[PDB]
Write a protein that binds this DNA or RNA. Structure first.
Ligand SMILES: [Mg+2]
Ligand SMILES: [Mg+2]
Ligand SMILES: [Mg+2]
Ligand SMILES: [Mg+2]
Ligand SMILES: [Mg+2]
Length: 215
DNA sequence: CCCGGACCTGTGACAAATTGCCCTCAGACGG
DNA sequence: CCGTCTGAGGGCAATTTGTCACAGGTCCGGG
């Protein structure tokens, strides 16, 4: 059975901007850390390729560029801002990378106030905003596999750090909402629907319902 | 009143970024 | 040693994401 990611809801709801490749790596860090810390984690090229069905070469490319793109990135818990890394990554051995996560982030990674999903649920998603949506939905999932939640549009925009043109609602619909609901429905075992909540002419919330395809 | 104006929607265009692929060649290891 | 399995480089064209102009709906209010 595949690895079970668990994380504090504060991370599920944090404001940050990460790529797909970076989020893939971030899932393993939370896994390494939780299985124990000083904050030093490690990534093997060949294991990454096998986990995500890549070649060794393209794995190397993904790890390398992800790693240098973390520099200057910051995380906000709603507020408090932290850097993800406190030293550049470096490779002691061929095919091996060593990384230094901000140890002050440990408690934000690790009661009842948590989110969980198996890694096989997300590893075919491509768009990182859809990984963010699927994580938020998991946070409200019931044991049996269903749930329903209303997310406010401004809060979606702030937390997922969506780009500026998606403050225009027709672009929000076309390039973020429809695409990410389609991936989830095509790439995960979840079957997802939604409806819009209005106040006057403005659309304010999105109401999500979902069930599991083992029913 | 009835136009111009402030709102809202969707779609056609184009620019910028990301995807999985492809090829080269030296490192690490063992037979 | 050398042949093989790796992975660190350099690239590519086809798709997807991010941006903005313009057509086309509603309601408001003062010349
Ligand atoms: Mg890649
Ligand atoms: Mg209005
Ligand atoms: Mg006219
Ligand atoms: Mg027409
Ligand atoms: Mg008009």
């Amino acid at each position: 059975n595949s690895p079970r990611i668990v994380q504090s809801n504060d991370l599920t709801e944090a404001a940050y901007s990460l790529s797909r490749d970076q989020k893939r790596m971030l899932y393993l860090f939370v896994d390494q850390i939780r299985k124990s810390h000083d904050g030093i984690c490690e990534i093997h090229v060949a294991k990454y390729a096998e986990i995500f069905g890549l070649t060794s070469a393209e794995a190397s490319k993904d790890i390398r560029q992800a790693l240098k793109s973390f520099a200057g990135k910051e995380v906000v818990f709603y507020y408090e801002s932290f850097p993800w890394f406190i030293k550049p990554a470096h490779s002691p051995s061929r095919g091996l990378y060593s990384v230094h996560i901000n140890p002050y982030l440990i408690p934000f990674f690790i009661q009842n106030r948590f989110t969980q999903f198996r890694l096989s649920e997300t590893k075919e998603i491509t768009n990182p905003y859809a990984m963010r949506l699927y994580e938020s939905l998991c946070q409200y999932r019931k044991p049996d596999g269903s749930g329903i939640v209303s997310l406010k549009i401004d809060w979606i925009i702030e937390r997922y750090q969506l780009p500026q043109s998606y403050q225009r609602m027709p672009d929000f619909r076309r390039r973020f909402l429809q695409v990410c609901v389609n991936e989830i429905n095509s790439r995960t075992p979840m079957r997802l629907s939604y409806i819009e909540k209005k106040k006057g002419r403005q659309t304010t919330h999105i109401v999500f319902s979902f069930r599991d395809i083992t029913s």
